[PDB]
């Protein structure tokens, strides 16, 4: 009998890296040991299987992303390397060792050639797969790069840091633009909302900060959740996003009107590490310190 969502995936180690394939029912995870798994998921009971694993990283895999063409999975690690794996069978195509001088925490694919990486000391690098060495090396942030987001127009890279600042970098000019005023909370998460008009940042105090597009110096608005922290966010619509917190609860949050819509689900009393949205829009995945990937029905929520 086929369910509304795929069954839970049980892991041997908790995963901070999580991403959905842009055209196939595949979910990638990277774990605290450094291993990388790709799972073929299905709403049919018992039909969700491990497709492949890759154990090439030497330390914790902090982030993973599928290329837009669906052929590659790019991964970054505490081992200070970037990996490029083939989606067919997880074969390592490329390892860039000592890509940063510190552990890498964040990864964003700009286009088929260009990507950004963020490290635990706040360093940003931009890469082109066609060119040896970084396009840009920018160290204005003072603390870890938690998360990054991309201008729809692909001109600006937005960074959320533990230093409490939103960072702005110009990809095309290869330069630093500005750091926001620092917030009291560490900025754990950054996502574009309202057709690219608003930047929403989650904080270590359980606050969502809003910035206006091209008003990046200071917040235009803010509101608190009834949660000690927000540690991950993913947009579901132009007005709805989902948050994960250290209390293990996944919340649906509306933006302007700023309102918590409800709890989507929980990893009972275990921190939520990361969220991702299926290429079809139907499923939210959450990765928890309970060592589970859980799938949530977004059709229910989108109404």
UniProtKB/Swiss-Prot annotation:
Family: Belongs to the WD repeat WDR55 family.
Location within or outside the cell: Nucleus, Nucleolus; Cytoplasm
Native organism: Homo sapiens
Entry keywords, A to Z: Cytoplasm, Nucleus, Phosphoprotein, Repeat, rRNA processing, WD repeat
Protein name: WD repeat-containing protein 55
Cellular component terms per the entry's GO annotation: cytoplasm; nucleolus; nucleoplasm
Lineage of origin: Eukaryota, Metazoa, Chordata, Craniata, Vertebrata
WD repeats (start-end): 10-49, 56-95, 99-137, 140-179, 182-221, 224-263, 267-303
Annotated function: Nucleolar protein that acts as a modulator of rRNA synthesis. Plays a central role during organogenesis.
Residues of the full protein shown: 27 to 329 of 383
Any one GO biological process: rRNA processing
Keyword set includes Nucleus: yes
Disulfides per UniProt: none
């Amino acid at each position: 009998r086929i369910r509304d969502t795929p069954e839970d995936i049980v892991l041997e180690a908790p995963a901070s890296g999580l991403a959905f394939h842009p055209a196939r029912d595949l979910l990638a995870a990277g774990d605290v040991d450094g291993d990388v798994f790709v799972f073929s998921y299905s709403c049919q009971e018992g039909e969700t299987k491990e497709l492949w694993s890759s154990g090439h990283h030497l330390k914790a895999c902090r982030a993973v992303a599928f290329s837009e063409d669906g052929q590659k999975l790019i991964t970054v690690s505490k081992d200070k390397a970037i990996h490029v794996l083939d989606v067919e069978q997880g074969q390592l195509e490329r390892r860039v060792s000592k890509a940063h001088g510190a552990p890498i925490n964040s990864l964003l694919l700009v286009d088929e050639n260009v990507l950004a990486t963020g490290d635990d000391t706040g360093g940003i690098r931009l890469w082109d797969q066609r060119k040896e060495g970084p396009l840009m090396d920018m160290r204005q942030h003072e603390e870890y790069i938690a998360d990054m987001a991309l201008d729809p127009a692909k001109k600006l890279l937005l960074t959320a840091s533990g230093d409490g600042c939103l960072g702005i970098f110009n990809i095309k000019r290869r330069r630093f633009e500005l750091l926001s005023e620092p917030q009291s909370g560490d900025l754990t998460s950054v996502t574009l909302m309202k057709w690219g008009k608003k930047v929403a940042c989650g904080s270590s105090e359980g606050t969502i900060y809003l910035f206006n597009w091209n008003g990046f110096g200071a917040t235009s608005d803010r509101f608190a959740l009834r949660a000690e922290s927000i540690d991950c966010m993913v947009p579901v619509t132009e007005s709805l996003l989902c948050t994960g917190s250290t209390d293990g609860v996944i919340r649906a949050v509306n933006i302007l009107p700023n309102r918590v819509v409800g709890s989507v689900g929980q990893h009972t009393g275990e921190p939520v590490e990361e969220l991702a949205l299926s290429h079809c829009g139907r499923f939210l995945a959450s990765s928890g310190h309970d060592q589970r990937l859980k799938f949530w029905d977004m059709a229910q929520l989108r109404a």
